[PDB]
Ligand binder design. Structure first.
Ligand SMILES: [Ca+2]
Ligand SMILES: [Ca+2]
Ligand SMILES: [Ca+2]
Ligand SMILES: [Cl-]
Ligand code: NA
Ligand code: NA
Ligand code: NA
Lengths: 4, 473
């Protein structure tokens, strides 16, 4: 996987 | 007579108001009396600086938790790189305090604001579920500026606990009216990503929000897809202004950017809208967004008029949010009828894809039955197919009213041979259309390669009602  | 904020950076918040009309028309909502009083928003991210001088007055511990370390305090982890600044930036867009001599103002500058510290660690399905399902009878609106990798080759969405949290939220959250989930559609533009390959944005339960630059263009990072609902301003090139918000270490930034900045602005506008009518359901909110969003002067080469006269784009959905129109329309809004779901299993046998496959099917949309739909909301083409190089596929779905939705554009980096396993490609572009009649699915090989595969299942899932339509635009 979960990217900003 | 409404007095606009005096905060020192408010004049730099070009996207909130102006003589120019390139804005989200937020001051018009403020002047109607809506600033977010009584509404609770939570930022699901890397934490929130709860003592920030522009957030402390609106901070709400009931809207906050630390899932990464399992404690109530979402304070970010401070590091030399300032890695964990992201959620604080998002929070200030929603609810930075007004008229306090500090930085600028949030869209909903009198709303209560929290944060869930859940990205600073391994983001498992359980972590997501505990965050999406946090205090759902207190938090009204959840904002998520994160998601699956934008490498242009990933197909990924909520696993079981997180999907269960979405359904529980929209069903029993907010007193049964349904949690509002706002999502950033993604930063994959450079990789030619599709936001329909992202299950969070592609969900019917999230308002997926895309971005426009100040001069009205499709930013470099923008992902096009049919699941996007609407747009808010964010960053662009270096001649274009950016987003002003609270930063880590009690600072102010004028350079918040990307898809990350668009979802919080939408969450703020939705907070003002909920203040104007607290009885709005999760589906009501999506109807308001569809009816009030504005295409005008957003530049795209794919604007199309759908079957009820509304302009819709894969880069922008129905266009830019319009806060003043949202709050005005909310006040006398009549709750929509309960959601119906009509399941149509299209195929009688598998079909080889080859260079091109077209599947035509005339449907009655559950005519004669309690789930009869004459007024579509979301539609899904749930596809199960094998293919040797997924990213060479382009997939389109044409509604009976002639609206062509791109379910999947070519993804040059997507080399996968894993195909799609009941992937529920979603479109918002046929909202309010009558779904009775001929649907067309087109699957084509966009490359010169001799690719091969088979479509083994195509379920058309229609959501909507059988009442309450407006005269087309
Ligand atoms: Ca903590
Ligand atoms: Ca301020
Ligand atoms: Ca993406
Ligand atoms: Cl369902
Ligand atoms: Na409910
Ligand atoms: Na969505
Ligand atoms: Na029809």
């Amino acid at each position: 996987x979960x990217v900003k | 007579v409404y007095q606009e904020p005096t905060d020192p950076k408010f004049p730099q918040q070009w996207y909130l108001s102006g003589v120019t009309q390139r804005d989200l028309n937020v001051k018009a909502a403020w002047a109607q009396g809506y600033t977010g009083h009584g509404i609770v928003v939570s930022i699901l991210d890397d934490g929130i600086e709860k003592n920030h001088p522009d957030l402390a007055g609106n901070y709400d511990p009931g809207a906050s938790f630390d899932v990464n370390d399992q404690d109530p305090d979402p304070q970010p982890r401070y590091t030399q790189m300032n890695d964990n600044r992201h959620g604080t930036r998002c929070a200030g867009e929603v609810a930075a305090v007004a008229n306090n001599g500090v930085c600028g103002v949030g869209v909903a500058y009198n709303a209560r604001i929290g944060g869930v510290r859940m990205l600073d660690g391994e983001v498992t399905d359980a972590v997501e579920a505990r965050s999406l399902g946090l205090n759902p009878n207190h938090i009204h609106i959840y904002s998520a500026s994160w998601g699956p990798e934008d490498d242009g080759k990933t197909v990924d969405g909520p696993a079981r606990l997180a999907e269960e949290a979405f359904f529980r939220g929209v069903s029993q959250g907010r007193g049964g009216l349904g949690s509002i989930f706002v999502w950033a559609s993604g930063n994959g533009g450079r990789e030619h990503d599709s936001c329909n390959c992202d299950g969070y944005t592609n969900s019917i339960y999230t308002l997926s929000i895309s971005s426009a630059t100040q001069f009205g263009n499709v930013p470099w990072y923008s992902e096009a897809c049919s699941s996007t609902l609407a747009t808010t301003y964010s960053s662009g090139n270096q001649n274009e202004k950016q987003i002003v918000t609270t930063d880590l270490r009690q600072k102010c930034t004028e350079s918040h950017t990307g898809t990350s900045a668009s979802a919080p602005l939408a969450a703020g506008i939705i907070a003002l809208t909920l203040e104007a009518n607290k009885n709005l359901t999760w589906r009501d909110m999506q109807h308001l967004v569809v009816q009030t969003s504005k295409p005008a002067h957003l530049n795209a080469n794919d604007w199309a008029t759908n079957g009820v006269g509304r302009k819709v784009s894969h880069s922008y959905g129905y266009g830019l949010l319009d806060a003043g129109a949202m709050v005005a329309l909310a006040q006398n809004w009549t709750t929509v009828a309960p959601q119906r779901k009509c399941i149509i299993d299209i195929l009688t046998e598998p079909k080889d894809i080859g260079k091109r496959l077209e599947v035509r099917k005339t449907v009655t949309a559950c005519l004669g039955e309690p789930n009869h739909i004459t007024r579509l909301e979301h539609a899904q083409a749930r596809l199960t197919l094998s293919y040797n190089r997924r990213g060479d596929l382009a997939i389109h779905l044409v509604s009976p009213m002639g609206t062509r939705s791109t379910l999947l554009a070519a993804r040059p980096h997507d080399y996968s041979a894993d195909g799609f396993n009941d992937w529920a490609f979603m479109t918002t572009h046929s909202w309010d259309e009558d779904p009775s009649g001929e649907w067309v699915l087109e699957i084509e090989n966009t490359s010169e390669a001799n690719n091969y595969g088979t479509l083994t299942k195509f379920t058309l899932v229609l959501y909507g009602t059988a009442s309450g339509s407006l005269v087309p635009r």
